[PDB]
Design a protein around this nucleic acid. Structure first.
Ligand SMILES: C[C@H](O)CN1C(=O)c2c3c(c(O)c(=O)n2[C@@]12CC[C@H]1C[C@H]12)C(=O)N(Cc1ccc(F)c(Cl)c1)CC3
Ligand SMILES: C[C@H](O)CN1C(=O)c2c3c(c(O)c(=O)n2[C@@]12CC[C@H]1C[C@H]12)C(=O)N(Cc1ccc(F)c(Cl)c1)CC3
Ligand SMILES: [Mg+2]
Ligand SMILES: [Mg+2]
Ligand SMILES: [Mg+2]
Ligand SMILES: [Mg+2]
Ligand SMILES: [Mg+2]
Ligand SMILES: [Mg+2]
Ligand SMILES: [Zn+2]
Ligand SMILES: [Zn+2]
Lengths: 368, 184, 368, 184
DNA sequence: TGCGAAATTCCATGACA
DNA sequence: ATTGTCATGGAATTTCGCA
DNA sequence: TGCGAAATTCCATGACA
DNA sequence: ATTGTCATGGAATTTCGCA
């Protein structure tokens, strides 16, 4: 716009250009004497190209792009034009990191009864022991009572075999698992349908969702590590010992062991609690029903100073799962279809697929 | 005298030899005395080795204060006695030829033996896969004397698999003739 | 000590045993009726074995070991005896995690002049490009001016070849590097001695120590990623472009580019700053000397609520570098010989070797 | 008229053919007009390709506003002209047979040619490895006219390698006879 | 009605790779 | 069409033993 | 001597694997 | 015998343009 710049040279006011400055012509270009120095005022029709040229040098953000532009030019609301370019650079949007943390975690209510929800996961590969490499970990959500199964692979077949042994005791309402091949198979879905078991899946690449079993994986490995100090890593024969050990370990915050929450009475294990000896089994089960309901429940922690929470319609970006060397860590912008809760969201990518993702694997697209 | 509790006494015994199913010929039966809860383990023999291998799985969940059995070789061996002493389990035997347990247990072992016989007819070689459903049936079976099922008495909650459809347990004239046909 | 328990049964006071309780004999053992219930008082000579037995079930900490013991027994100051056992369990000490964070980071003073200190490091392996797999990154500490060299391996030979090209411009006083094979070799030490260059090494497995170059590795990779979007990863021909791009990029906090801090004048690059055009080179170098000294310097951040700082004589534990599966994450306790600064320490392991380590790779041994 | 600055003009030229050292036969010489700073690049030929390959390394550090050279084939080619236009570098040529630069530059190229000749005698095939030490020498060499060395004028600091031991640059009677011996 | 010490509770730290 | 968890050992706070 | 908007500064976040 | 760093883009704060 050389027409807009003409009125300025004459001396009459244009909204955006301060009247107190001296606008002139030199070397065939409109100039202005600003405190910083004499800058060139490019016509509106040239500004996009300048911003793009400045930005493209090192694909710089707001201030670093501005500082370059400001070396030669001046125009009203330069950063407004810088931000327009930053918001259109596909390379920057998919390569840059987020600088907004996720909102505070949710502390889902503890399942009310044992067998309401099981959390399952695999540990491994571990050093080979008797031809076994993996461990199938089953955690009852309410009690924390764990069942351990050595497997040769994290397969549907080994999960089914193990769970057919476990479910001889009781059948769970729900089985929560991650999106590992072993649990997302049609063979596993068929196995659950046949038994009235509902399969609930974690958002992908978010093991915090399976937090209950993940945390038990830490204790299993920590104990196996201790027992195997200065000996070959023959863990296969220790799984039963580890299982019994952990199921009978106090949780200092609850002041109960997973065995006690499941049965309301210690079995013939060392240091068995004898406090309900004079109670009848009915009096004992009545006290257990009371203990199970009065357990401590943590609350959501404070939000960090710079957190973001999802909004329907918001342009958001999913994190690349297994990013290759020298490739972007982010996918192209997506739109938030539904906000399931403040930490879970349904998105529609550029393909047109519906994906239920965790906000931990999302960043809000920058510059609107 | 202190009230009866789960894990106070486990009653063990062997069922078989049965037709081979997945290479297995016997079922070790474990019944908790108080709750009447049943655990079934298929073995390839009624041996101390098989008893120890099976009971090592059970004792990784809960350890009984006492194990009760008849004078079967597998239970009277010095090996099985060493295994029990290690776990602080007292062994208890019934008088030879005079097997005694309890009313609740004697009745439970009858239902076990009958339910197994009922499902053996037609598929006598497919019982290995049926052991989980047989246990859920047995453990979600209402107790006339106590008002509660073994599952309720052990966990203090109702089950997600209530076996409301209380079946016969007795053989139909068709199953009866089909059973005597296998006896050939 | 059954002698100590005898006086108690009679009814006369012993320090530690509250007089208000009823101490008796039953089943051939001293008992006490406590609010919790009737507990057995084992003789002092038996307590160590009980604590060890309770602890060994799942190698439990203080409260979880206590809660088991308290099920059957009672004695004065039980936790004092629990903590004695925890402090002697080699398995627990080398397997358990720390729960004390390191003290706040140091913000070393920025080198005063260009060429005072160089920070060097390798990036790679990268996808092969013209037979090259690595990048030798050289960062001048004062300026942030970077030199990039493609290499076939992170070798002493490729470092020497590259640095012989760089040092044709100017020779640094110090070269700071990590403990990578390429820089710790005798051939590299010989190469530096020959040139008056002092080699300074980071504490091992602490890349924050090489923070200056590490941070530049992020910008190099981020820019290569952007330029290679939707094209094969042919990075070899982009190193020169990336080098020039980054050396001429503004640091928004300094309001200077690494080129400007090194030369005090922009070269014929896009958007070159023209503010010193009327100054003589001497006036220009005078202003540069002033700019170099007035640069922003960050200060140590606040200590976290539960931080630990090293003390000479303290029992401390070094983190295992490459821990194997099911093996302890910590080495056996060591003693702090000298405290170089609050974040660096000299230790003596059980072998008798002197090691200069970062507190980030140390935990203070628990239970004194 | 604005004061002279570094990167305002780079004076380029070729030295050689020299005895082969590591396969190289020539040295492209780049002297900054203002500071007198020297960059040396060994080439296998005085070609546009070699000039472009060498200057691509230099222009990754700093880009001159103007390049000055004589009418040598490598610098007058349309390829070298395309290369300069791409980088916004103005090419400037001296009149054929009349090479003009500046007093500071003319003197610098004399020291370069002399220092090279001085070190070529005895080890004429080992100059590739000596190029870094030759440049540090040249750049840490005090300027009578300006009071400062090219290193000081370019970085605004003293160097860590001061070449206080100001040598001869002239050939000794032993080096003179040894030089004429090679001329065979 | 209050003191010193012991017992209990709190809770940041870090790992489930 | 879902969602972090909790053992750990110093510190902080409460309770105990006695008066 | 004070208003609205623009410009600048602040700074938590996250990655150098 | 050593030690974190700094681009990034919303928010917070300051400065500018005008009166
Ligand atoms: C392709 C790649 O293998 C994908 N993948 C994992 O990386 C992975 C992890 C874990 C799994 O259970 C798990 O199944 N996987 C899968 C996804 C499904 C199946 C292929 C396996 C896992 O537990 N960890 C440890 C971890 C780390 C941080 C935490 F906050 C928590 Cl709570 C746990 C994190 C890595
Ligand atoms: C045997 C194993 O290869 C050992 N090792 C590394 O793991 C490693 C890293 C790094 C190196 O430079 C580096 O040299 N190494 C070496 C040690 C010496 C040589 C064998 C290589 C490195 O930069 N990163 C990224 C990183 C991560 C977190 C940070 F806070 C920072 Cl500032 C950077 C962390 C991993
Ligand atoms: Mg998994
Ligand atoms: Mg996992
Ligand atoms: Mg019998
Ligand atoms: Mg390195
Ligand atoms: Mg590194
Ligand atoms: Mg010439
Ligand atoms: Zn960009
Ligand atoms: Zn231990």
């Amino acid at each position: 716009l050389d027409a807009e710049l003409d009125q300025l040279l004459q001396g009459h006011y244009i909204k955006g250009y301060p009247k107190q400055y001296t606008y002139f012509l030199e070397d065939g270009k409109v100039k202005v004497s600003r405190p910083e120095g004499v800058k060139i005022i490019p016509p509106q029709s040239d500004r996009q190209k300048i911003v793009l040229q400045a930005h493209n040098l090192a694909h710089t953000g707001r201030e670093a792009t501005l500082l370059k532009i400001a070396n030669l030019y001046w125009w009203p609301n330069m950063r407004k034009d810088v931000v327009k370019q930053l918001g259109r650079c596909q390379q920057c949007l998919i390569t840059n990191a987020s600088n907004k943390a996720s909102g505070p975690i949710l502390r889902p209510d503890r399942p009310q009864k044992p067998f309401d929800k099981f959390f399952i996961d695999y540990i491994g590969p571990l050093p080979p022991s008797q031809g076994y490499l993996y461990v199938l970990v089953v955690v009852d959500g309410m009690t924390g009572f764990t069942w351990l199964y050595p497997t040769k692979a994290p397969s549907t077949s080994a999960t089914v075999k193990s769970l057919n042994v476990l479910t001889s005791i009781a059948i769970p309402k729900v089985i929560h698992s991650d999106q590992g091949a072993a649990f997302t198979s049609s063979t596993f879905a068929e196995w659950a349908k046949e038994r009235g078991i509902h399969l609930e899946f974690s958002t992908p690449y978010h093991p915090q969702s399976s937090g209950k079993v993940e945390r038990k994986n830490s204790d299993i490995k920590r104990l196996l590590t201790k027992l195997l100090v200065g000996r070959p890593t023959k863990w296969y024969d220790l799984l039963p010992v580890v299982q019994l050990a952990l199921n009978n370990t106090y949780s200092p915050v609850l002041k109960y062991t997973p065995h006690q929450l499941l049965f309301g009475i210690d079995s013939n294990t060392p240091f068995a609690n004898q406090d309900t000896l004079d109670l009848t089994r009915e009096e004992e089960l009545s006290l257990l029903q009371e203990i199970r309901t009065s357990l401590y429940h943590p609350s959501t922690p404070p939000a960090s100073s710079r957190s973001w929470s999802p909004v329907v319609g918001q342009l958001v970006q999913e994190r690349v799962a297994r990013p290759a060397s020298l490739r972007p860590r982010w996918h192209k912008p997506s739109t938030v279809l539904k906000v399931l809760n403040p930490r879970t969201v349904v998105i529609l990518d550029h393909l047109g697929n519906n994906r239920t993702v965790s906000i931990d694997n999302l960043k809000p697209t920058s510059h609107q | 005298d202190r009230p009866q509790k789960p894990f106070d006494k486990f009653f063990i015994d062997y069922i078989g030899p049965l037709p081979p199913s997945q290479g297995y010929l016997y079922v070790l039966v474990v019944v908790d005395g108080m709750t009447g809860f049943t655990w079934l383990y298929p073995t390839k023999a009624p041996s101390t080795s098989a008893t120890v291998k099976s009971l090592n799985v059970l004792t990784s969940i809960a350890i009984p204060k006492v194990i009760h059995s008849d004078q079967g070789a597998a239970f009277t061996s010095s090996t099985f006695a060493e295994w029990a002493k290690e776990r602080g389990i007292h062994l208890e035997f019934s008088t030879p030829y005079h097997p005694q347990s309890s009313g609740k247990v004697e009745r439970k072992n009858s239902d076990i033996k009958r339910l197994l016989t009922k499902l053996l007819v037609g598929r006598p070689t497919k019982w290995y896969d049926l052991l989980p459903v047989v246990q859920l049936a047995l453990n979600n079976t209402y107790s006339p004397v106590l008002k509660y099922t073994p599952h309720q008495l052990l966990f203090g909650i109702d089950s997600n698999t209530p076996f409301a459809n209380q079946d016969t347990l007795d053989l139909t004239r068709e199953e009866e003739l089909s059973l005597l046909q296998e006896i050939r």
